[PDB]
Design an enzyme around this catalytic site. Sequence first.
Site, PDB file in Angstrom:
ATOM      1  N   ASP A  35       0.844  -1.194   0.000  1.00  0.00           N
ATOM      2  CA  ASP A  35       0.000   0.000   0.000  1.00  0.00           C
ATOM      3  C   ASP A  35       0.879   1.245   0.000  1.00  0.00           C
ATOM      4  O   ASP A  35       1.355   1.679   1.053  1.00  0.00           O
ATOM      5  CB  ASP A  35      -0.882  -0.026   1.245  1.00  0.00           C
ATOM      6  N   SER A 199      -0.400  15.359 -12.237  1.00  0.00           N
ATOM      7  CA  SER A 199      -0.611  14.977 -13.622  1.00  0.00           C
ATOM      8  C   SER A 199      -0.858  16.222 -14.469  1.00  0.00           C
ATOM      9  O   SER A 199      -1.429  17.213 -14.005  1.00  0.00           O
ATOM     10  CB  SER A 199      -1.808  14.037 -13.708  1.00  0.00           C
TER      11      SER A 199
HETATM   12  O1  LIG Z   1      -6.739  -1.873   1.195  1.00  0.00           O
HETATM   13  S1  LIG Z   1      -8.052  -1.278   1.301  1.00  0.00           S
HETATM   14  O2  LIG Z   1      -8.534  -1.124  -0.070  1.00  0.00           O
HETATM   15  C1  LIG Z   1      -9.210  -2.326   2.320  1.00  0.00           C
HETATM   16  C2  LIG Z   1      -9.751  -1.843   3.486  1.00  0.00           C
HETATM   17  N1  LIG Z   1     -10.565  -2.590   4.208  1.00  0.00           N
HETATM   18  C3  LIG Z   1     -10.876  -3.817   3.835  1.00  0.00           C
HETATM   19  C4  LIG Z   1     -10.358  -4.376   2.644  1.00  0.00           C
HETATM   20  C5  LIG Z   1     -10.707  -5.727   2.228  1.00  0.00           C
HETATM   21  C6  LIG Z   1     -10.168  -6.223   1.044  1.00  0.00           C
HETATM   22  C7  LIG Z   1      -9.325  -5.467   0.266  1.00  0.00           C
HETATM   23  C8  LIG Z   1      -8.975  -4.146   0.675  1.00  0.00           C
HETATM   24  C9  LIG Z   1      -9.525  -3.634   1.884  1.00  0.00           C
HETATM   25  N2  LIG Z   1      -7.960   0.254   2.115  1.00  0.00           N
HETATM   26  C10 LIG Z   1      -6.915   0.357   3.111  1.00  0.00           C
HETATM   27  C11 LIG Z   1      -5.680   1.037   2.502  1.00  0.00           C
HETATM   28  C12 LIG Z   1      -6.108   1.846   1.255  1.00  0.00           C
HETATM   29  N3  LIG Z   1      -7.123   2.841   1.507  1.00  0.00           N
HETATM   30  C13 LIG Z   1      -8.402   2.428   0.996  1.00  0.00           C
HETATM   31  C14 LIG Z   1      -8.980   1.240   1.767  1.00  0.00           C
END
Ligand SMILES: O=S(=O)(c1cncc2ccccc12)N1CCCNCC1
Length: 330
Positions: A35, A199
């Site tokens: 991430d 961008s």
């Molecule tokens: O990774 S997540 O997409 C995310 C959060 N909760 C549950 C999830 C279940 C499956 C896949 C992803 C999830 N996330 C956290 C970091 C990025 N910010 C946006 C939200």
Amino acid sequence: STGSATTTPIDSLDDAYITPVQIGTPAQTLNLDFDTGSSDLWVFSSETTASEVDGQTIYTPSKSTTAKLLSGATWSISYGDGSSSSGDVYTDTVSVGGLTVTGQAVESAKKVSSSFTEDSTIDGLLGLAFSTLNTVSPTQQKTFFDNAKASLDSPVFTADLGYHAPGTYNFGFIDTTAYTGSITYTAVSTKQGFWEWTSTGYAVGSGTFKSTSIDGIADTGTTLLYLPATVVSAYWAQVSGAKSSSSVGGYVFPCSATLPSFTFGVGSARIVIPGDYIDFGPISTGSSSCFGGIQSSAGIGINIFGDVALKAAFVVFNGATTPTLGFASK
Ligand SMILES: O=S(=O)(c1cncc2ccccc12)N1CCCNCC1
């Protein structure tokens, strides 16, 4: 040193990507969501409330001979979608794709929110934003990349996410066979702790390129492409029958549509997102209304170049003294 690991979509829609990570001694392999929009390495663990674990692989620090409890340290994170997790902290050995960091802070979850529990494919997150965002208290901890950086051949990592296919995260080197043409580099602001860049504009399908500055973040941990309402309206206006649905929470479109591409500018260069990358499938099982992959950032407060955008490119996260971002077509 270098590392190289394959990253795999968790489902048929590329809703997120998982990468195997070795933690502890003997290794415990967990599949983490890398991430670039956050800065905590947190895992499901033997300490996670039992009712909040549903199929994830857990880290058990008591079985790692190199784990050490970081005395007094706790963490708590609240993500922009309302999800959250919290717990205590160990240091341990962490390896990705052959690259090893000793003494990495591994944030063991005592609590996770329901949407993490409900995704059995993700065993935790590995944050790759700047360490200023790390939530450990009272002593903030460094990301895996920050800890690895000085040992790497070059202080860089690259994201090469696949469309409906595996991809690669590399640390410490640029694989010049993984992209076409040249890499165009662009300035980064770290003022908000993100890989934040500007961008130079966009085009919809074969339409004319609109030169306009769009400040946003390169975020591998966000699935979709979140852009200003004007830009998103211009995109969906080219899809017959598409509409913003308040009940669904964004733009939806008839599943029978053929979506146009979306191009974004990186300096004078252009990254083309094929239309198929923007289809996130039926809004509910059996529906003929489909969820769009380009959505408005209004009320997020930031534009987000999430996986929809990044998977159309080979992306260099250059962590030199003055960080930059590079994008190439592939
Ligand atoms: O990774 S997540 O997409 C995310 C959060 N909760 C549950 C999830 C279940 C499956 C896949 C992803 C999830 N996330 C956290 C970091 C990025 N910010 C946006 C939200």
